[PDB]
Write an enzyme that holds these catalytic residues in place. Structure first.
Site, PDB file in Angstrom:
ATOM      1  N   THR A 147       0.838  -1.190   0.000  1.00  0.00           N
ATOM      2  CA  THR A 147       0.000   0.000   0.000  1.00  0.00           C
ATOM      3  C   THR A 147       0.878   1.247   0.000  1.00  0.00           C
ATOM      4  OG1 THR A 147      -1.797   1.142   1.156  1.00  0.00           O
ATOM      5  CG2 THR A 147      -0.148   0.014   2.513  1.00  0.00           C
ATOM      6  N   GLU A 188      -4.546  -3.102   5.016  1.00  0.00           N
ATOM      7  CA  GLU A 188      -4.078  -3.777   6.218  1.00  0.00           C
ATOM      8  C   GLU A 188      -5.141  -4.653   6.873  1.00  0.00           C
ATOM      9  OE1 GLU A 188      -3.814  -0.659   5.492  1.00  0.00           O
ATOM     10  OE2 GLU A 188      -1.719  -0.026   5.608  1.00  0.00           O
ATOM     11  N   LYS A 238      -5.452  21.061  14.104  1.00  0.00           N
ATOM     12  CA  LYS A 238      -5.340  21.239  15.550  1.00  0.00           C
ATOM     13  C   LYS A 238      -5.520  22.710  15.935  1.00  0.00           C
ATOM     14  CE  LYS A 238      -2.112  17.345  15.693  1.00  0.00           C
ATOM     15  NZ  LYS A 238      -0.885  16.793  16.326  1.00  0.00           N
ATOM     16  N   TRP A 266     -10.283  20.139  17.525  1.00  0.00           N
ATOM     17  CA  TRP A 266      -9.857  19.565  16.255  1.00  0.00           C
ATOM     18  C   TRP A 266     -11.032  19.508  15.287  1.00  0.00           C
ATOM     19  CZ3 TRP A 266      -5.834  15.026  16.767  1.00  0.00           C
ATOM     20  CH2 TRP A 266      -4.747  15.484  17.519  1.00  0.00           C
TER      21      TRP A 266
HETATM   22  C1  LIG Z   1     -18.125  -5.453   0.660  1.00  0.00           C
HETATM   23  C2  LIG Z   1     -17.522  -4.214   1.276  1.00  0.00           C
HETATM   24  C3  LIG Z   1     -16.310  -3.704   0.522  1.00  0.00           C
HETATM   25  C4  LIG Z   1     -15.709  -2.432   1.092  1.00  0.00           C
HETATM   26  C5  LIG Z   1     -14.225  -2.536   1.400  1.00  0.00           C
HETATM   27  C6  LIG Z   1     -13.375  -1.501   0.684  1.00  0.00           C
HETATM   28  C7  LIG Z   1     -11.897  -1.577   1.024  1.00  0.00           C
HETATM   29  C8  LIG Z   1     -11.052  -0.533   0.313  1.00  0.00           C
HETATM   30  C9  LIG Z   1      -9.579  -0.608   0.683  1.00  0.00           C
HETATM   31  C10 LIG Z   1      -8.765   0.554   0.194  1.00  0.00           C
HETATM   32  O1  LIG Z   1      -9.184   1.364  -0.606  1.00  0.00           O
HETATM   33  O2  LIG Z   1      -7.566   0.609   0.714  1.00  0.00           O
HETATM   34  P1  LIG Z   1      -6.278   1.481   0.798  1.00  0.00           P
HETATM   35  O3  LIG Z   1      -5.226   1.190   1.842  1.00  0.00           O
HETATM   36  O4  LIG Z   1      -5.854   1.812  -0.613  1.00  0.00           O
HETATM   37  O5  LIG Z   1      -7.174   2.680   1.340  1.00  0.00           O
HETATM   38  C11 LIG Z   1      -7.681   2.665   2.664  1.00  0.00           C
HETATM   39  C12 LIG Z   1      -8.247   4.002   3.063  1.00  0.00           C
HETATM   40  O6  LIG Z   1      -9.348   4.347   2.190  1.00  0.00           O
HETATM   41  C13 LIG Z   1     -10.286   5.134   2.891  1.00  0.00           C
HETATM   42  N1  LIG Z   1     -11.607   4.489   2.793  1.00  0.00           N
HETATM   43  C14 LIG Z   1     -11.838   3.205   2.464  1.00  0.00           C
HETATM   44  N2  LIG Z   1     -13.167   2.934   2.463  1.00  0.00           N
HETATM   45  C15 LIG Z   1     -13.810   4.066   2.798  1.00  0.00           C
HETATM   46  C16 LIG Z   1     -15.220   4.479   2.982  1.00  0.00           C
HETATM   47  N3  LIG Z   1     -16.235   3.602   2.806  1.00  0.00           N
HETATM   48  N4  LIG Z   1     -15.457   5.760   3.334  1.00  0.00           N
HETATM   49  C17 LIG Z   1     -14.458   6.643   3.515  1.00  0.00           C
HETATM   50  N5  LIG Z   1     -13.159   6.337   3.365  1.00  0.00           N
HETATM   51  C18 LIG Z   1     -12.777   5.089   3.013  1.00  0.00           C
HETATM   52  C19 LIG Z   1      -9.814   5.248   4.344  1.00  0.00           C
HETATM   53  O7  LIG Z   1      -9.117   6.476   4.493  1.00  0.00           O
HETATM   54  C20 LIG Z   1      -8.854   4.068   4.453  1.00  0.00           C
HETATM   55  O8  LIG Z   1      -7.885   4.215   5.474  1.00  0.00           O
HETATM   56 MG    MG Z   2      -4.267   1.498   3.831  1.00  0.00          MG
END
Ligand SMILES: CCCCCCCCCC(=O)OP(=O)(O)OC[C@H]1O[C@@H](n2cnc3c(N)ncnc32)[C@H](O)[C@@H]1O
Ligand code: MG
Ligand SMILES: CCCCCCCCCC(=O)OP(=O)(O)OC[C@H]1O[C@@H](n2cnc3c(N)ncnc32)[C@H](O)[C@@H]1O
Ligand SMILES: [C][C][C][C][C][C][C][C][C]/C([O])=O/P([O])(=O)O[C][C]1O[C](N2[C]=NC3=C2N=[C]N=C3[N])[C]([O])[C]1[O]
Ligand code: MG
Ligand code: MG
Lengths: 530, 530, 530
Positions: free
Chosen positions: B172, B319, B429, B434
């Site tokens: 990632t 993760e 901050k 916040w």
């Molecule tokens: C059947 C349900 C499926 C949903 C699972 C989706 C997983 C997506 C994983 C992903 O995009 O991973 P990364 O490490 O590239 O990004 C993770 C970050 O993405 C943001 N995030 C992910 N899902 C979100 C929703 N539903 N709303 C808002 N933000 C989201 C987060 O910042 C996360 O840390």
């Molecule tokens: Mg991530």
């Protein structure tokens, strides 16, 4: 315990506090006695944990329960394992001597016994000597369990331990001479819940257990975790109705008034429910029942379907979780007529998720999956007992060849439907052509005046074994051996000779010996004929 | 490996060969290029295992894949882990330098690369020096993978090993300076499939993934196992459609002609699909899509609902499996109007089965679950990465306090709906109050001529931090700082002072720096302002 | 096994092949059926070892024996342990259900059963399911054991293994509800033989077991290794006479014609031998008998002494080897009159070599060794069972406080003579003044028309317990409660009040419940009165 936070342990406390859904206002109903919410259920679980800790119950101790299907039983499914103790479910339908044997063998420290089972305890109380405290359960305010819970706080920090810690234990009768104790760990129970909830519920339309269902078990909760379904219903956060002692009128009233949609029972209980006079005016359209523990008759399945009941069969045993296979119908099969649907729903079922099911011979050769080739079912699954408790030779025979031996003879068709024919011990060894006793019993069960059929089979000089049949008859409507032989003749298929009229040698017997559970004890029947 | 038959191991081969349902005539469709049955899929998996064994791939080796969503990718999800090797999913959307870093860090032995990614490989091929063989994948008969499979038999005996054997790995981007490698074992992937299939599918009517569905992923298969859904669809034995390289017209044609009912994609892909001209005449009534990876806009959700799409949100990260929470609606919520349903479906979602989700402060104090109190999400689940591969300090920070730190700031209401506000690194901050940068970005995103908003926040003498905002504007429609400040004023809620007009200090910027993935790189933006 | 030649292991094969003395022409006599020399005895032991090896008996297997005191039993004492197998001695006097329980619990592989015990086997044969072969023993040429021995050679190389390998096991009835299995290792049996042979035999003139003696057991060989004396007699190479099924005329004829000088039996067998009509003309001057298993009555001891029998008492239990104490008389005590000698010989005895014997209270405080202070005997010895087989809580209670709890209440005088008063379970808790039930039973046993006395004791409001007495009377010679109370009064010593006439409350009962062994079952008697 060295608890590594990143090393997740599959524990029942994760089933309770990390469910699929959790509605704190969803109700847990104990017949007409008690109602409380899921939040109250969790509070009572923590109170029971506190009471058990006060009672001196530590991790590794065994707590025995002798109770009907109640909220107390469910609170025992969670609390007792969730503190590291072993939950011993006592089969209250066994003879008092067998119950005493199981209590002594498991070495229970605490026994939670319903006041209605006190006559059973009084016969064996003097010979236990291993139980330090008895808690008497009642369906009123004078229940000792309720008083113990009332003295405790609703806060508890449930420990983290190895997922392989034994959570539940119980004894199956079988044919070993003594009850054999099987045990399941936290990991095995969690995996059973996960796998079966992935199996049923993900079905398209038929036979679903889903978050909108209302759950009412009609299978005793000492019978293999009530088929593991109370855990599944708690994990789904559905409304749970517990009927207590089984009365057909009470069961039907609970189904009607609590809007029960999902249930499970043995075929005899379903027959009693459908034959009850008050069931005729009841609406069974939204009720789903899964039939296990015994073969579901096609006639009973058809009668249930004619009442708009989503009835389907399942299969398992005390050693296997229990669930190994469940009948799941494709949308094409749901379009079939009532008779074909009854034929499909009465099957043993397709193996559930994560289960390896094979039919093998005496040498474990994995017979081909045709709809006629019958062999012993051997299984691998995440929720199988590794051995019998404090037993070696029977444990070795159970897992012979690297697979758990179910002792059931079945044929699996091309599409994966299992169909149990009979037990391994009931095989009739007519030279190389082994025939099932249950098919002959079913053939003879259609006679004009027959009541009960039990084909034994006794040694023969030429064919090795010949199917001796025992037949009970209607009162004063006596039928001779020759008439039964004539009726049994001219049926479809036969063994080695014509229609086996020279080998059947039916004998009319006053009564058929039965075990404490109620199944036919063919071992005792063999004593009277060989 | 000392394989005890009674000691069941949770392996991906049990996902493949012991599924919830298995129809040998069910089709696996790769867009308009290839179609074959599930029996052919299993045969190809065994052929790929044989080819990998011939290629010298042993247990513990790493096989890298650079491919679009195809049948080959799925055959890699199974075959490569099922022989004990580690499947490295390369993010083809990263920069060539980052891809080279990931390849060198994971030390891949074999790389399966699509011919369209050969220009990427040619930039870094000379600096790899660790890959012994490259297999070029093509969408025609000249594919090297297909030729390798053709030389192998369809019989393979997949080994039994510890369920903790690492099965998949991928990197990632994040904000660590270098890509961080996360890995998942066979046990973790099997538990992810089981838990999510227990979560979705057991829902009453809305948002079900069931055996009658037709599956088409619109999430890249290198992106956290494509959210683990290909395994789930294979486990359910449903018809799987793989679109290859994403084209909105091709995706819509596949949805229409293959009767796709279940899909998953990021909100941008859903917006592109709904904005395509040919989507207006398409029937979306039977199509269910789950939106993850980014916050689902309420307007986009409402537009999808107006097309009769069962659209709901989910949450996870590389993760965490990834799935941690999925939006599941009660039957009462399904009766609400379109606007309220869009509000509920756009939430981060309720935590899925076996997941512990808490919102905590900087000291990990488990903030109360109100609909306004925001804290960092920390999770425990059976499918979390224990650490970053070959990393110590970032691994220690990831699991600080005994919980996996998601880096997302969210509030969880009383009924359990999570709602992500922004990232931890994006927190402004302003003394003890916040505030989230994303709420201000959304407020400024409604301006008459605004195009893109990126609130950074730079140090301030009095308040510690003040929300500096960067705004991009429509061509030739220039808007000054004071006009943007006036528009941002008089909105609901504010920080410390009036409507924060004295602290917003909006600056018009020609462009906003973005990472290789496409998200706004606020670390680079901080270089230009502090 | 890693056999270090310098690391000597205490094995039963060293008892057999390295004895104190070995005369190859010394005879082993089985009543009037068979006679053979010690060389033939060793040859038969090796032949039996060969037969067991052919029968598939390996080290660690359990071989059960259901036989009378015979040469076959002795050949089983050596051969079965000497090949590493466990010898299970079945108490043939238990009920068939108890025998079945012991067989199932020990999991015997081979059962050597005398043809006279076949009716017992036929009642439980169908419920064993754990025994692979039954060998039927007969006192003629058609014995299956003899035929099995005849097919084998007289050469065998007995293996070397750890001295802690379990050699013998058997089940004691007790009061646990189920028989409890105790086990002894090779080291424990060798040490028992050595210690007791150092205890008796080194006595000056009285009570010697020496190389010139002729040995005939009248204690069943399933009863704690027949008190370990067959091993001792074999170790001394003395002439051994085995009587088979006990008949007083046969026993007396064997004593007279075989010149038997050393024997051992329970007091009832000695009473039967002395009361036999043909014993009056027999010469008992050279016969020594040691009485164990029950308290030796002073009258019986005096009657035996009047026949010039060197009669002395011993003490032990199934858990303790058994021998813990033997009556050994100093030369000064041998000069006393008949009454004083009978008083000394009827004592429980002085503790044997290597045995630590203490009398303790409920808190294990090591009560002083006065001739009146009574407490529970707790012992440490090289030949004590470490626990009950496959039992935990009863095992923990057995070794509570670091000492084996005998359950016997006794007082030890200054010179070291133990005198058992009664059992711990039979203690009458009259406030702080505990009194023995056996003393009151003995007092009431001197009545004119009394037949059997069993003092139970039932709870009392003031004194806690009061000694309720049950008395059986001679036919038609009825005696009322008041007459028995009057007879019991005015005796030496009493509890708390006068002569306990207000608390004795004697009740005339038709019969007294007894266990399968024959001892009074006071637990069943408590059911009829409290
Ligand atoms: C059947 C349900 C499926 C949903 C699972 C989706 C997983 C997506 C994983 C992903 O995009 O991973 P990364 O490490 O590239 O990004 C993770 C970050 O993405 C943001 N995030 C992910 N899902 C979100 C929703 N539903 N709303 C808002 N933000 C989201 C987060 O910042 C996360 O840390
Ligand atoms: Mg991530
Ligand atoms: C050479 C000396 C031989 C004497 C050893 C005799 C061992 C007898 C073992 C026996 O009978 O065992 P169980 O578990 O069946 O019974 C044990 C209980 O028997 C009573 N007992 C045994 N010996 C006794 C004497 N000498 N006096 C009084 N009671 C005796 C005890 O209650 C014992 O716990
Ligand atoms: C959901 C689903 C559910 C189902 C499951 C059920 C389970 C039951 C268990 C029991 O019953 O157990 P035991 O007691 O051990 O038993 C066993 C036996 O039984 C029989 N079965 C059962 N099931 C069935 C049967 N048969 C026929 N069919 C069916 N289904 C057998 O034999 C076994 O082994
Ligand atoms: Mg069973
Ligand atoms: Mg004893």
């Amino acid at each position: 315990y060295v608890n590594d936070p990143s090393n997740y342990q599959l524990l029942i406390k994760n089933l309770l506090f990390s469910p699929v859904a959790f509605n704190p206002e969803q109700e847990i109903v104990y017949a007409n006695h008690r109602r409380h919410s899921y939040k109250t259920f969790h509070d009572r679980v923590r109170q029971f944990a506190n009471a058990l800790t006060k009672m001196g119950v530590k991790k590794g101790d065994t707590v025995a329960v002798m109770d009907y299907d109640s909220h107390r039983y469910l609170e025992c499914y969670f609390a007792i394992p969730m503190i590291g103790a072993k939950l011993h479910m006592i089969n209250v339908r066994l003879s008092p001597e067998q119950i005493l044997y199981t209590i002594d063998h498991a070495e229970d420290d605490i026994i939670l016994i319903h006041e209605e089972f006190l006559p059973i305890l009084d016969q064996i109380k003097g010979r236990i000597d291993t139980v330090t405290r008895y808690v008497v359960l009642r369906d009123d305010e004078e229940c000792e369990y309720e008083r113990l819970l009332e003295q405790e706080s609703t806060e508890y920090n449930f420990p983290d331990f190895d997922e392989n810690t034994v959570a539940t234990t119980f004894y199956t009768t079988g044919t070993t001479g003594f009850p054999k104790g099987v045990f399941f760990t936290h990991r095995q129970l969690v995996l059973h819940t996960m796998g079966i909830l992935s199996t049923i519920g993900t079905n398209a339309s038929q036979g679903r257990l889903h978050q909108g269902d209302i759950y009412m078990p009609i299978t005793p909760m000492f019978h293999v975790h009530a088929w593991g379904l109370p855990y599944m219903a708690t994990m789904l956060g559905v409304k749970q109705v517990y009927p207590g002692k089984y009365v057909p009128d009470v069961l039907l009233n609970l189904i009607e008034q609590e809007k029960v949609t999902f249930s499970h029972c043995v075929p005899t209980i379903l027959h009693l429910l459908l034959s009850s006079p008050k069931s005729k005016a009841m609406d069974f359209s939204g009720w789903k029942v899964v039939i296990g523990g015994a073969a579901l008759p096609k006639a009973l399945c058809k009668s249930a379907l004619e009442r708009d009941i989503d009835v389907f069969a399942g299969y398992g045993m005390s050693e296997t979780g229990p669930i190994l296979s469940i009948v799941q119908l494709t949308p094409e099969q749901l379009e079939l007529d009532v008779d074909q649907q009854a034929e499909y729903r009465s099957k043993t079922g397709k193996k559930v998720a994560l289960v390896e099911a094979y039919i093998v011979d005496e040498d474990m050769n994995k017979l081909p999956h045709d709809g006629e080739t019958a062999g012993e079912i051997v299984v691998r699954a995440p929720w199988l007992t590794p051995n019998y408790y404090k037993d070696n030779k029977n444990s070795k025979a159970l897992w012979r060849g690297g697979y758990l031996h179910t002792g059931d003879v079945a044929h699996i068709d091309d599409e994966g439907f299992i169909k149990i024919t009979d037990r391994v011990k009931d095989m009739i060894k007519i030279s190389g052509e082994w025939v099932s006793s249950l098919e002959l019993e079913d053939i003879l069960h259609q006679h004009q005046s027959v009541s009960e059929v039990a084909v034994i089979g006794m040694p023969h000089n030429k064919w090795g074994e010949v199917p001796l049949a025992l037949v009970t008859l209607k009162e004063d409507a006596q039928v001779t051996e020759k008439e039964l032989l004539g009726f049994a003749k001219d049926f479809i298929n036969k063994g080695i000779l014509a229609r086996e009229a020279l080998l059947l040698k039916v004998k009319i017997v006053d009564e058929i010996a039965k075990t404490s559970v109620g199944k036919v004890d063919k071992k005792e029947l063999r004593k009277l004929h060989l």
